[PDB]
Amino acid sequence: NKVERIWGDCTVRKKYSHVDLVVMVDGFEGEKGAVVAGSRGYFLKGVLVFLEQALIQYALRTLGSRGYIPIYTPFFMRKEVMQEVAQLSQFDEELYKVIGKGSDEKYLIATSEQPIAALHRDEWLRPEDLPIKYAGLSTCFRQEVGSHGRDTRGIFRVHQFEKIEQFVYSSPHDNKSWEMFEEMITTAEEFYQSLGIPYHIVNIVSGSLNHAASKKLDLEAWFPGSGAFRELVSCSNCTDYQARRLRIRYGQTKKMMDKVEFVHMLNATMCATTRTICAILENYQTEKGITVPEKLKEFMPPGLQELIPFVKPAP
Amino acid sequence: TLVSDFKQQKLEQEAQKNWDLFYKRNSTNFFKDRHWTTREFEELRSQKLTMLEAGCGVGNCLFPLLEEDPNIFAYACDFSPRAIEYVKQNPLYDTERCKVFQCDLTKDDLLDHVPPESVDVVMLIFVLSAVHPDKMHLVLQNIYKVLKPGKSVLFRDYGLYDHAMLRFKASSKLGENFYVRQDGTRSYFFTDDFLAQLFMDTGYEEVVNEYVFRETVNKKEGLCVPRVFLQSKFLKPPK
Amino acid sequence: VLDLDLFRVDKGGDPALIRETQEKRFKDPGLVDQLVKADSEWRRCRFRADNLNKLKNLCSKTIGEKMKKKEDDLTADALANLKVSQIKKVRLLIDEAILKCDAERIKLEAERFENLREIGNLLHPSVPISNDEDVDNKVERIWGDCTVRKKYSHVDLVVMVDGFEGEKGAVVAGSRGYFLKGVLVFLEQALIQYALRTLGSRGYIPIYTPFFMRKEVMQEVAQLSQFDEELYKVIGKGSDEKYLIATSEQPIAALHRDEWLRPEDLPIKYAGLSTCFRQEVGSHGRDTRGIFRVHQFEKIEQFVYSSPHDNKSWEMFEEMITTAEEFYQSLGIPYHIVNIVSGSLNHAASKKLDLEAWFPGSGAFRELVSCSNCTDYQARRLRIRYGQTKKMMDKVEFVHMLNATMCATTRTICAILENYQTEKGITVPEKLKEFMPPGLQELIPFVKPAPIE
RNA sequence: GCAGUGGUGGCCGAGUGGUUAAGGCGUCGGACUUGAAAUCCGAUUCGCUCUGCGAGCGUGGGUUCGAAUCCCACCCACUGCGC
Ligand SMILES: Nc1ncnc2c1ncn2[C@@H]1O[C@H](CSCC[C@H](N)C(=O)O)[C@@H](O)[C@H]1O
Ligand SMILES: [Mg+2]
Ligand SMILES: [Mg+2]
Ligand SMILES: [Mg+2]
């Protein structure tokens, strides 16, 4: 994996990992959550609900200032539509199935990129409006929560989490898709530089790419209490792989004896709230609590605008 | 408001069972011997003085005054079998000075075990408060027939507005001045007028009937509290 | 469920009162009589099963003693005079009797329980006894102007602001699916921020709940009808006993499940935040379409565990309805408070108040808040005890549990849109301008024409 | 999702095929002591026709006369993997 650029200090180390910090601030309920929902179920409470909401507010305003349109999506999708945006591997391994009455065939979404992709299916887009940018906001549901040590427990790998996505439909001409790809990863990078999270950008190897992706960049943040890099953002350019399966066409008119061109589609995570909360807690821990990042103070309630205090001991 | 009227009936029909299970769970370790008895009453001071102890418990009221003065014969009454067995298994027990027997002072009669007009002093120490307010005169009449016509009856029990009355939560109230403990035993808090007009209705004559005030203090918790017991002596009319 | 001793008349119970309550709720009496007979039979069957168990235990003890000393009117001494083989012969008869008694007892238990789960909570004496909700629902209070009329209903207003995608939503998710987009995502988020901040300042603990509840736990917090036809079922790899929650009150109720709560700190207040998934969406006209009745929506809930003594849960009930009232008064939305009739309460509720907001573009009253006091009906099922210590003789007391919707985001958005429409756009409520982006702090402009026009 | 170890009462923690589920800790009430207490005595899972008997040691089952102890399944943790 080719590391492309570094930002911040990715070697400093601090006392606790997120697995202890979420309990020390009293914002996590894992045992009762596993009683209610089962393995990995969790309640998030108190100061951590306010912090997650502050993250959503800050991400939405950051993306809205850039020209993205916020969009709240449905959380389940008809199977006939989900096939066109997902792979077979995903359905058995990662997609929950929703059953109504009379035994429908809907699936809970794994990411808001899946409903946003189907928002323009079977359409002829006007080339004039093509940099179409959406900021998806939704709850994602994954089945795979396999653990790899203590530092992967807590709220790091869960079945249910809120995520803010970047989704762009782009012209397929003049290398504009790749310029937009660079712009998307730069937007994510600036989001994490303004939060003060150190990271490096990684160029993912061709072996670990999904079928649609023609290139992928991950943003991996440094976790000083865990001593590891963890992936927080994934940026991908799928070109016209999904556009032609969904039949999203570039021009509004077809030429006689000339095949149509499809738009280019790019998606990039902006903020998965649980993982970003983990990174914030690990990077801003002090001896008396967690310092609130300077950019989230305006979105926090009074009383939680300078410090999230420790109220319990570390397990 | 008050305790369920169904529950108060269950408390009345299970009074003896509740006192018996008290002696089962607490053994003879709950109450402590009363050494203040001889000093408090002008009787019992230093010939053959036959005595009846109504509600004898496991002792704790007759064994002190009985090892103190060695010319006293004692009758012991209690409706709980466990208390009688504990009194008998006491090493200080000897049949030549004591005659213990079970007798429900409201249902049973005392003449089945003691001779009429024989006892010269009978003691009621924290026994009448465990009896239902509407069956107390039953006890007074049951003991009226065994008292020598010049003898007397000694009485100490809870009085009105004592602290123990004030600690009771409202869910433990059966009626005016009538409460129930966690274990099922009950507590009636007497007033001078109530006790006077309860003894007068059964043929007694009042001699002394006045409150006794004390206090309880736990230094470690720094708790000092008022206590109000009612002490009295009633006398059976000579002629 | 109700306390079984309310039906035992040999205890302090009275089934006649349960009959009166079951009549006032316009439910089936005689369910009480079926319950009483099933329970009285179950008690005798339990007595017999305990006696058979005692005999089996005594046989095993005697066998053990015979073996270690190196050797059904039965008594202790009676068995002490048998060889081991004979005691085992007796044990076989004991086994047969125990097995048939166990079958009978399991049947009686299931029957008594299926009769008990269909008897409703006792009613607060303030409930209006009736079965006609449209006629006898008592209006308690009114706030604001509930007769003004305005041009568009929410069904048009959500499109004129370009914040709603219905056709594409139904293509993606099916009937009633929708994309919320643009200015209405910011407005929903503003509502969530404002409601969470208000509830947090009142002393509620914000809590983000899981959306999948297990079946074993959902049975204890839900009803037969809901659990049957109202809940979506989730299935993962394997099979799958999980059910998408219909409200955040369901997981929060199971948060202190099977606990002995200290009386100090008893008034625990929770501001639940989750997405709710309801399967029933019926359209009674045009003004109930749009985002008014949907399958998926975010809801902020009040949930309070209270002391069962000293009328504390009813004071808490008034406090919760007052919190919701003040919320909607700061949002500037007119409403009236209605007391629901006996026939419309669900089984757990002793009383239910509803806040019904006036929709000036639709000309109707629509229910936004629903505040219920379910007393110990649910705590007894979940075994949430009021003290930490059990008394010597008294029975265990359970906490009361109240819940009240604070804000369902879609319906409140509809109310705000209908009440703040002008000719050029939607005026932003003064209490939501803190939480809106710059540029969306004074007006949400109309950018499309009305679909009716 | 595998392939290992585990799961005791409000909590900690013993438990050895014949417990009274020990010892603590926490909580709750009762106190009548004249030798009062800088404390003592108790209770503290569910059920029944309650001074007793029955059930309960993650949940269900099996073997045994008898299981909290042995076996199996499932669930949930922790340690290693797959992802
Ligand atoms: N109606 C009644 N007839 C006989 N005994 C009774 C009674 N009501 C209560 N008792 C007995 O009175 C006792 C009160 S405890 C007090 C015992 C004694 N007075 C002492 O100083 O130690 C109880 O043991 C109870 O068994
Ligand atoms: Mg434990
Ligand atoms: Mg113990
Ligand atoms: Mg078991």
Tab-separated table of C-alpha atoms in Angstrom, chain A residues 29 32-38 41-46 49-50 52-54 56-57 60-61 64 69-78 81 92-101 106 108 115-116 118-121 123 134 137 139 141 143-144 159-162 298-302 305, chain C residues 165 168-175 177-182 185-186 188-190 192-193 196-197 200 205-214 217 229-237 242 244 251-252 254-257 259 270 273 275 277 279-280 295-298 434-438 441:
chain	number	residue	atom	x	y	z
A	29	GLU	CA	-23.450	0.713	27.173
A	32	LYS	CA	-27.106	-3.963	28.051
A	33	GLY	CA	-26.847	-3.293	24.327
A	34	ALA	CA	-25.830	-6.898	23.753
A	35	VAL	CA	-28.776	-7.974	25.883
A	36	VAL	CA	-31.164	-5.868	23.804
A	37	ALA	CA	-29.681	-6.254	20.318
A	38	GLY	CA	-27.097	-9.022	20.669
A	41	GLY	CA	-25.244	-4.025	20.061
A	42	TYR	CA	-24.719	-0.838	21.980
A	43	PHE	CA	-26.382	2.170	23.499
A	44	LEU	CA	-24.640	5.490	23.042
A	45	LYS	CA	-25.520	7.995	25.711
A	46	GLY	CA	-24.843	11.339	27.262
A	49	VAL	CA	-24.615	11.553	21.584
A	50	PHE	CA	-23.915	15.284	21.635
A	52	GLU	CA	-21.873	12.524	17.325
A	53	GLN	CA	-24.516	15.138	16.561
A	54	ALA	CA	-21.854	17.847	16.512
A	56	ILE	CA	-22.899	15.412	11.773
A	57	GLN	CA	-23.591	19.149	11.928
A	60	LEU	CA	-22.994	18.716	6.766
A	61	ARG	CA	-22.059	22.386	6.884
A	64	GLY	CA	-22.906	22.201	2.019
A	69	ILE	CA	-26.809	18.747	-1.544
A	70	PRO	CA	-27.638	17.004	1.752
A	71	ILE	CA	-29.811	13.986	1.248
A	72	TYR	CA	-31.470	11.716	3.793
A	73	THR	CA	-32.032	8.344	2.241
A	74	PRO	CA	-34.313	5.369	2.811
A	75	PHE	CA	-32.729	2.733	5.000
A	76	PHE	CA	-33.970	-0.252	3.041
A	77	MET	CA	-34.020	-0.880	-0.666
A	78	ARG	CA	-35.891	-3.225	-2.964
A	81	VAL	CA	-32.623	-2.158	-7.235
A	92	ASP	CA	-24.963	-13.053	1.692
A	93	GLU	CA	-22.078	-11.730	3.765
A	94	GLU	CA	-23.158	-8.214	4.636
A	95	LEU	CA	-26.772	-7.330	3.869
A	96	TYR	CA	-29.604	-7.739	6.341
A	97	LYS	CA	-32.961	-8.762	4.910
A	98	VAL	CA	-36.197	-7.087	5.985
A	99	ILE	CA	-39.409	-9.116	6.052
A	100	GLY	CA	-42.792	-7.452	6.072
A	101	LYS	CA	-46.192	-9.125	6.132
A	106	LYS	CA	-36.051	-5.529	1.001
A	108	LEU	CA	-31.094	-2.702	4.846
A	115	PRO	CA	-29.630	4.592	-2.456
A	116	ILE	CA	-27.967	7.714	-3.868
A	118	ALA	CA	-30.263	4.620	-7.596
A	119	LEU	CA	-31.592	8.165	-7.306
A	120	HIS	CA	-30.910	8.868	-10.990
A	121	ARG	CA	-31.316	5.403	-12.476
A	123	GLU	CA	-32.050	9.004	-16.731
A	134	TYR	CA	-24.679	14.848	-2.914
A	137	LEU	CA	-26.709	11.081	5.485
A	139	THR	CA	-27.634	4.847	9.077
A	141	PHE	CA	-26.059	-1.717	8.732
A	143	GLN	CA	-23.187	-7.881	9.513
A	144	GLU	CA	-19.414	-8.423	9.656
A	159	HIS	CA	-23.487	-3.311	13.211
A	160	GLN	CA	-25.155	0.097	13.112
A	161	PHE	CA	-23.681	3.558	12.710
A	162	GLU	CA	-24.379	6.904	11.081
A	298	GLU	CA	-20.100	25.739	18.309
A	299	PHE	CA	-22.123	22.553	17.797
A	300	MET	CA	-21.839	21.347	21.379
A	301	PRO	CA	-24.232	22.166	24.217
A	302	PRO	CA	-23.188	24.704	26.843
A	305	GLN	CA	-17.673	23.254	25.001
C	165	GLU	CA	-38.423	12.965	-3.519
C	168	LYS	CA	-37.756	8.018	-6.772
C	169	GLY	CA	-38.151	7.014	-3.143
C	170	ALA	CA	-40.922	4.611	-4.080
C	171	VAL	CA	-38.750	3.246	-6.868
C	172	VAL	CA	-35.931	2.648	-4.386
C	173	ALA	CA	-37.806	1.553	-1.263
C	174	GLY	CA	-41.388	1.004	-2.445
C	175	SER	CA	-44.756	2.439	-1.382
C	177	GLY	CA	-40.324	5.497	0.456
C	178	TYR	CA	-38.863	8.954	0.231
C	179	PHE	CA	-35.653	10.915	-0.066
C	180	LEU	CA	-35.481	13.986	2.103
C	181	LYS	CA	-33.090	16.454	0.560
C	182	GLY	CA	-31.676	19.938	0.676
C	185	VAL	CA	-32.421	17.806	5.898
C	186	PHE	CA	-31.068	20.939	7.556
C	188	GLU	CA	-34.778	18.065	10.449
C	189	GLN	CA	-31.298	18.304	11.939
C	190	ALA	CA	-32.191	21.658	13.482
C	192	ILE	CA	-33.135	17.255	16.497
C	193	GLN	CA	-30.537	19.649	17.903
C	196	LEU	CA	-31.998	17.284	22.395
C	197	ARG	CA	-30.747	20.540	23.878
C	200	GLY	CA	-30.840	17.792	28.141
C	205	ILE	CA	-29.993	11.805	29.438
C	206	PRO	CA	-29.729	11.666	25.631
C	207	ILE	CA	-29.478	8.082	24.506
C	208	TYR	CA	-29.031	6.653	21.027
C	209	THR	CA	-30.604	3.261	20.952
C	210	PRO	CA	-29.987	0.179	18.844
C	211	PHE	CA	-32.570	-0.295	16.078
C	212	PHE	CA	-32.676	-4.127	16.181
C	213	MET	CA	-34.339	-5.646	19.280
C	214	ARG	CA	-34.257	-9.378	19.934
C	217	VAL	CA	-36.869	-8.901	24.726
C	229	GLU	CA	-48.486	-7.098	12.072
C	230	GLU	CA	-46.700	-3.844	12.911
C	231	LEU	CA	-43.027	-4.849	13.265
C	232	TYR	CA	-40.525	-5.569	10.527
C	233	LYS	CA	-38.408	-8.679	10.969
C	234	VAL	CA	-34.658	-8.594	10.320
C	235	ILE	CA	-32.745	-11.631	9.073
C	236	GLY	CA	-28.970	-12.013	8.940
C	237	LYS	CA	-26.726	-14.885	7.936
C	242	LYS	CA	-34.661	-9.488	15.480
C	244	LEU	CA	-36.876	-3.301	13.790
C	251	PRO	CA	-35.201	-0.507	23.740
C	252	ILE	CA	-35.037	2.059	26.541
C	254	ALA	CA	-35.314	-2.937	28.210
C	255	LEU	CA	-32.332	-0.909	29.399
C	256	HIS	CA	-32.961	-1.462	33.119
C	257	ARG	CA	-34.516	-4.867	32.560
C	259	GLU	CA	-32.815	-4.771	37.987
C	270	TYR	CA	-34.114	9.367	29.126
C	273	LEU	CA	-33.167	9.256	19.773
C	275	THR	CA	-35.166	5.937	13.659
C	277	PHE	CA	-39.900	1.708	11.451
C	279	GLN	CA	-45.330	-0.951	8.731
C	280	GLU	CA	-48.857	0.511	8.816
C	295	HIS	CA	-42.444	3.825	7.092
C	296	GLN	CA	-39.242	5.364	8.441
C	297	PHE	CA	-38.686	8.511	10.475
C	298	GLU	CA	-36.637	9.890	13.339
C	434	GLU	CA	-29.167	28.810	15.752
C	435	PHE	CA	-29.039	25.388	14.121
C	436	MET	CA	-29.507	26.329	10.543
C	437	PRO	CA	-26.681	26.969	8.077
C	438	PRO	CA	-25.949	30.540	7.022
C	441	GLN	CA	-31.611	31.404	8.817
